[PDB]
Amino acid sequence: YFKIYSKHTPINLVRDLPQGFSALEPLVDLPIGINITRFQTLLALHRS
Amino acid sequence: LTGTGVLTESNKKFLPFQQFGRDIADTTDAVRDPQTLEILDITPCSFGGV
Ligand SMILES: *[C@@H]1O[C@H](CO)[C@@H](O)[C@H](O)[C@H]1NC(C)=O
Ligand SMILES: *[C@@H]1O[C@H](CO)[C@@H](O)[C@H](O)[C@H]1NC(C)=O
């Protein structure tokens, strides 16, 4: 069972993590049923 | 979820992933109606010593 908990927070700090409290609400409970041991996030390029 | 209690209109605001609410004894004291999404307190029926 793949659980997604999410929270969006308006911040204005430049570099590091803000210091504060914000509880993450569950967003999507996802029925995959597969083995996961390694992950990788996706970025986007800018071309000019 | 079966039970017996007085149903009253509730001021609690459930998050959309929440269906019911539990008290100290883990009995459902607040519930969301599954047809019209509104919250109801469930106060128990009166108990007395005769
Ligand atoms: C999940 O994958 C890892 C690495 O491939 C492996 O060591 C492990 O035994 C796997 N677990 C299951 C339940 O297949
Ligand atoms: C049926 O239930 C949904 C919630 O699942 C609700 O949004 C809708 O208003 C209900 N319709 C009727 C006719 O009760």
Question: How many CB atoms within 10 Å of residue A30?
Answer: 10
DSSP conformation class of B34? S
How far off is chain B from A28, nearest CA to CA, in Å?
Answer: 10
CA B22 to ligand 2 center in whole angstroms: 25
B48 Rama class: left (phi>0) / alpha (psi -120 to 50) / beta: beta
∠ Cα A23 A25 A27 (to 5°):
150
What residues have CB less than 8 Å from B12, skipping those under 6 apart?
B21, B30, B39, B41
Fill in the amino acid letter for A47.
R
Distances (CA, A) of B31 to B11, B13, B42: 12, 11, 7
**Resolution in Å, one decimal place:** 2.3
Indicate which residue's Cα is closest to atom 7 of ligand 1: A37
Which residues between 2 and 41 in chain B have a beta carbon less than 8 angstroms from any beta carbon of chain A?
15, 17
